[PDB]
Design a protein around this ligand. Structure first.
Ligand SMILES: [Mg+2]
Length: 306
């Protein structure tokens, strides 16, 4: 029996848990009332918070199910570890340990490696495992380049482009993005910016889309400079530059229909496309779909030499 530690940033499971979630993200400081209410407003705006946490749960359960289905060597048992929501990463490691798991494979629900996301989770996990003793975790570090994951986005882009009118098809701009992080990740030689660029190149070339740009989104609000340009500004500059009639956003850095996509893309980016004369396109996110879950299974099996 192999442990399958699936990690993510996490989103509150209940509306009532948003403040604690915000407090945790703020490292122990309660959000100001206005700050808090505004986050609550954004979840409402996208339909409510309830469905969100459930996607991550299904991604992990389905990956567990599929892995145990496609091969008969290893029996996997999924354990979800979240950065800012319970169960926390350490809690999930403590539970695998308590359950008698001695070997575990972990994967983060973010294809691109970065010190702040992927590396941070793996470290916290391997550290709690050492402290407990007798449990070794083999961690996946990046998987933006898994042929099957690339193909999932390639087909979705091909579909969207073949689905637009000719006036737009040949005057469109593809925007591949990921979650922004403080520029100071450079101090650690964080390849994250490069991985989004390769991720973008792979998808555009695969879909045969010639015009594309790389952007960042959802930067947090801190004193430090975050990776840019942001998808909002990038869209505007490319429109003033060449007058694109359609913008196709591929938030490849995200795996589900969370706030960053439903709101930061579907809303804020459409605002710009609306404020300008272009049409808004954002292909279906991976979520827990079979094609995506198979890609992840393949990622996990490869990591194990299977
Ligand atoms: Mg924002």
């Amino acid at each position: 029996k192999m442990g399958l530690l699936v990690m993510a940033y996490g989103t509150p499971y209940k509306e009532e848990d948003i403040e604690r979630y915000y407090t945790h993200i703020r490292r122990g400081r309660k959000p100001e009332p206005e700050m808090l209410q505004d986050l609550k407003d954004r979840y409402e705006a996208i339909g409510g918070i309830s469905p969100l946490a459930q996607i991550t749960e299904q991604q992990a359960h389905n990956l567990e199910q599929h892995l145990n289905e496609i091969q008969d060597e290893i029996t996997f048992k999924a354990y979800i570890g979240l950065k800012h929501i319970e169960p926390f990463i350490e809690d999930a490691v403590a539970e695998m340990h308590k359950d008698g798991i001695t070997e575990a494979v972990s994967i983060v629900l973010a294809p691109h490696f970065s010190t702040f996301s992927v590396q941070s989770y793996n470290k916290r996990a391997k550290e709690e495992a050492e402290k407990l003793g007798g449990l070794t975790i083999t961690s996946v570090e990046s998987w933006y380049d898994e042929p099957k994951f690339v193909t999932y986005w390639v087909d979705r882009v091909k579909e969207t482009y073949a689905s637009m009118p000719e006036d737009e098809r040949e005057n469109a701009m593809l925007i591949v993005s990921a979650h922004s992080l403080p520029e100071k990740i450079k101090e650690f030689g964080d390849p994250y910016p490069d991985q989004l660029h390769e991720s973008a190149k792979l998808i555009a070339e695969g879909a045969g889309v010639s015009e594309y740009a790389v952007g960042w989104q959802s930067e947090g609000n801190t004193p430090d400079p975050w990776l840019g340009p942001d998808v909002q500004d990038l869209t505007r500059d490319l429109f003033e530059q060449k007058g694109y009639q359609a913008f196709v956003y591929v938030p490849v850095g995200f795996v589900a229909d969370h706030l960053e996509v439903l709101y930061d893309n579907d809303y804020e980016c459409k605002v710009v496309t609306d404020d300008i004369g272009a049409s808004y396109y954002r292909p279906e996110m991976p979520n827990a779909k079979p094609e995506f879950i198979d890609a992840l299974a393949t990622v996990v099996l490869k990591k194990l030499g299977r």
